Amino acid sequence: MTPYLQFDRNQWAALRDMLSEDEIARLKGINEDLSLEEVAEIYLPLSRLLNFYISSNLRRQAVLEQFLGTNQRIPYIISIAGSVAVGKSTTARVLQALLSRWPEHRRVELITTDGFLHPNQVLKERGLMKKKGFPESYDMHRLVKFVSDLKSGVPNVTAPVYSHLIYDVIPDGDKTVVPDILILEGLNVLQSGMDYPHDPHHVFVSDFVDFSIYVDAPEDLLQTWYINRFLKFREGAFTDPDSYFHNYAKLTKEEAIKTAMTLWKEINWLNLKQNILPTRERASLILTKSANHAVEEVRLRK
Amino acid sequence: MTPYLQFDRNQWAALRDMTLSEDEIARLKGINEDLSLEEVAEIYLPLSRLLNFYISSNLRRQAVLEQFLGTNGQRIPYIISIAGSVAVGKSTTARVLQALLSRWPEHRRVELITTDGFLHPNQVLKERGLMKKKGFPESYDMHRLVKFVSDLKSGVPNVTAPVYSHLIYDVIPDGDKTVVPDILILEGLNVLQSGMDYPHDPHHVFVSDFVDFSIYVDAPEDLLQTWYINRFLKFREGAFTDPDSYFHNYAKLTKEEAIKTAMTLWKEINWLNLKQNILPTRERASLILTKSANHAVEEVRLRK
Ligand SMILES: Nc1ncnc2c1ncn2[C@@H]1O[C@H](COP(=O)(O)OP(=O)(O)O)[C@@H](O)[C@H]1O
Ligand SMILES: Nc1ncnc2c1ncn2[C@@H]1O[C@H](COP(=O)(O)OP(=O)(O)O)[C@@H](O)[C@H]1O
Ligand SMILES: CC(C)(CO)[C@@H](O)C(=O)NCCC(=O)O
Numbered sequence: 001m002t003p004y005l006q007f008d009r010n011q012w013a014a015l016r017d018m019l020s021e022d023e024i025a026r027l028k029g030i031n032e033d034l035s036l037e038e039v040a041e042i043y044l045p046l047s048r049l050l051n052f053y054i055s056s057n058l059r060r061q062a063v064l065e066q067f068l069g070t071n072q073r074i075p076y077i078i079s080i081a082g083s084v085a086v087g088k089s090t091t092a093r094v095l096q097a098l099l100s101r102w103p104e105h106r107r108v109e110l111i112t113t114d115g116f117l118h119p120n121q122v123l124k125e126r127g128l129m130k131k132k133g134f135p136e137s138y139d140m141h142r143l144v145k146f147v148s149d150l151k152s153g154v155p156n157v158t159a160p161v162y163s164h165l166i167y168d169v170i171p172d173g174d175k176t177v178v179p180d181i182l183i184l185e186g187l188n189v190l191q192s193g194m195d196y197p198h199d200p201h202h203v204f205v206s207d208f209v210d211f212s213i214y215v216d217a218p219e220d221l222l223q224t225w226y227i228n229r230f231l232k233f234r235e236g237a238f239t240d241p242d243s244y245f246h247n248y249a250k251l252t253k254e255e256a257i258k259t260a261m262t263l264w265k266e267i268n269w270l271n272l273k274q275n276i277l278p279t280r281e282r283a284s285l286i287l288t289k290s291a292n293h294a295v296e297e298v299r300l301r302k
Numbered sequence: 303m304t305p306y307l308q309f310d311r312n313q314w315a316a317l318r319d320m321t322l323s324e325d326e327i328a329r330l331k332g333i334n335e336d337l338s339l340e341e342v343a344e345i346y347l348p349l350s351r352l353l354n355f356y357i358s359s360n361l362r363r364q365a366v367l368e369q370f371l372g373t374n375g376q377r378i379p380y381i382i383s384i385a386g387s388v389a390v391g392k393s394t395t396a397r398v399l400q401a402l403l404s405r406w407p408e409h410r411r412v413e414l415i416t417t418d419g420f421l422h423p424n425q426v427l428k429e430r431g432l433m434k435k436k437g438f439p440e441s442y443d444m445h446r447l448v449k450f451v452s453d454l455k456s457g458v459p460n461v462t463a464p465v466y467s468h469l470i471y472d473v474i475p476d477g478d479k480t481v482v483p484d485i486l487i488l489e490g491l492n493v494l495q496s497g498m499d500y501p502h503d504p505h506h507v508f509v510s511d512f513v514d515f516s517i518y519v520d521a522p523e524d525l526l527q528t529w530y531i532n533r534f535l536k537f538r539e540g541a542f543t544d545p546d547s548y549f550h551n552y553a554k555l556t557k558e559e560a561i562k563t564a565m566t567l568w569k570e571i572n573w574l575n576l577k578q579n580i581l582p583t584r585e586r587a588s589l590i591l592t593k594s595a596n597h598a599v600e601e602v603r604l605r606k
């Protein structure tokens with residue numbers, strides 16, 4: 001047996017017994033390629049599950065508040081891990097939208113770990129410009145302190161912001177979080193001190209996370225999704241010489257595809273095998289994706 | 303602000319509204335003759351109440367989820383771990399909590415397992431030249447400890463754990479203990495450690511990943527040394543007429559030199575272990591129980 005309850009697509013979709021015109025438009029605005037049937041059969045039930053954990057947490061809090069005689073609101077935190085291009089950003093944003101359906105979750109914030117990467121200046125200095133996503137490219141102590149402060153009750157917490165448009169951290173663009181729920185999305189949210197032997201931390205991100213989800217998918221599908229996303233970014237930079245991807249418009253489509261393929265195999269895939277995939281069993285829930293991003297399996301810790 | 307709610311002794315003791323039976327009082331004395339009954343009433347009863355709230359909350363949610371997921375799965379044991387320095391009082395704390403948690407009709411089975419049993423036998427330790435490193439990461443068969451709590455959290459009906467004997471100073475060759483429980487208390491100095499502590503043989507899912515609530519018993523080095531030495535002395539005294547005891551070896555030394563010997567085991571082995579491997583894991587605990595003179599609890603910190 002394993003520490004996980006398992007559900008194939010049908011079993012998971014069977015969990016349903018809930019979307020409005022505004023809500024359907026918002027989901028399409030999130031990702032035009034997002035299937036409404038996928039949302040209805042997979043993500044709605046997932047948001048319900050999450051709400052049960054959150055509700056349970058809120059009720060516990062009230063019972064303990066009475067017993068302990070205390071006076072403070074602390075954000076419930078959900079992290080989302082997985083390979084680059086597996087769909088963390090889409091999953092996070094979909095969950096942010098759905099969790100907003102409950103009157104209790106008036107404020108659902110979303111922060112990605114991309115922002116906590118060391119700026120390109122610093123990475124170049126360390127010779128890590130070809131290692132974005134790897135442990136050493138992150139200012140981990142800062143990421144840990146971010147969730148630590150939130151879990152300490154600090155009213156306003158600030159997070160750095162990254163721009164895939166300029167391919168670097170935005171100098172003066174730090175975002176200020178003022179939330180009932182915080183969704184932390186990043187390939188490294190399940191990593192820990194062992195992943196940073198060069199600069200170890202002893203309290204991990206997971207130590208300040210209530211529920212963690214690992215989005216999973218085969219290497220062959222991840223490669224395809226990565227490349228197709230790359231191509232979209234390239235196309236979108238054809239008339240924007242200020243865009244980082246405008247550098248790929250000079251290449252023929254064919255050489256651009258090979259370039260993307262090389263970025264995937266030598267950087268992102270290597271990162272997946274050495275640092276990301278090994279953290280999968282630390283997740284509260286594993287979301288296994290299949291062709292066309294269809295979820296085929298859901299595993300939840302017993 | 304910190305990730306912890308804080309309570310000094312008085313504020314904590316103020317959490318109590320409970321009366322202990324004559325049999326319950328007899329059991330506590332039996333657990334440890336020096337355990338203050340007042341201490342139990344003002345510190346440990348409230349702590350057992352707190353734990354019960356977390357456990358209850360877990361059981362209720364399990365019901366809500368069973369209904370939703372339609373998975374009338376196996377009952378999974380709620381696991382509580384207790385960490386801290388050698389001689390801080392983990393064993394006493396665990397046994398006291400085991401007794402108190404038994405008061406609720408819901409917690410019929412409250413098992414207690416110590417990680418000492420998961421140490422590599424002396425033979426293995428000697429061949430690896432680690433006989434002077436008991437308690438350090440490399441002296442543990444960590445993969446086995448991880449699998450133990452992993453199996454419990456997988457719903458495995460009966461799980462077996464190796465057992466250690468402080469009297470023979472080694473793993474008991476054929477004394478494995480079989481756990482068949484609503485609650486499992488896992489006591490050990492290394493329950494909060496992780497992969498980073500075992501670079502020589504890394505694991506990627508930690509003990510804490512299978513623990514519901516963790517407690518770190520904390521105390522100053524000066525008090526820990528005193529408690530360690532006094533426990534050592536009682537161990538030596540108990541071995542005076544037992545040539546089949548590990549501590550008989552110390553009966554040959556004058557009390558004075560026996561104390562210095564004990565003091566040396568403390569400083570060069572246990573204290574070093576505390577500084578390099580145990581103390582750093584403290585902030586990973588759900589609750590920090592800080593003891594002071596005579597083992598009196600002076601502070602309690604609980605994760606917000
Ligand atoms: N559920 C989904 N349905 C359809 N396309 C998806 C889905 N999730 C992700 N994608 C697409 O696949 C790619 C990877 O998702 P993205 O969120 O950018 O990855 P990540 O944040 O994990 O790096 C994007 O091109 C995105 O539009
Ligand atoms: N609450 C307590 N009150 C009085 N004495 C205690 C208490 N807890 C522990 N002790 C004593 O202090 C010593 C250390 O406790 P012990 O449980 O053996 O340590 P550990 O399991 O952490 O190695 C023992 O000699 C024990 O009798
Ligand atoms: C910032 C990450 C790691 C995650 O979002 C990714 O966008 C990235 O830049 N990876 C490095 C190799 C690449 O895809 O260019």
Ligand SMILES: CC(C)(CO)[C@@H](O)C(=O)NCCC(=O)O
Nearest residue numbers: 388418436437438491567571572
């Ligand atoms: C078994 C441990 C590691 C913890 O219970 C400790 O009691 C031990 O025997 N080793 C430290 C050296 C000593 O006190 O003899």
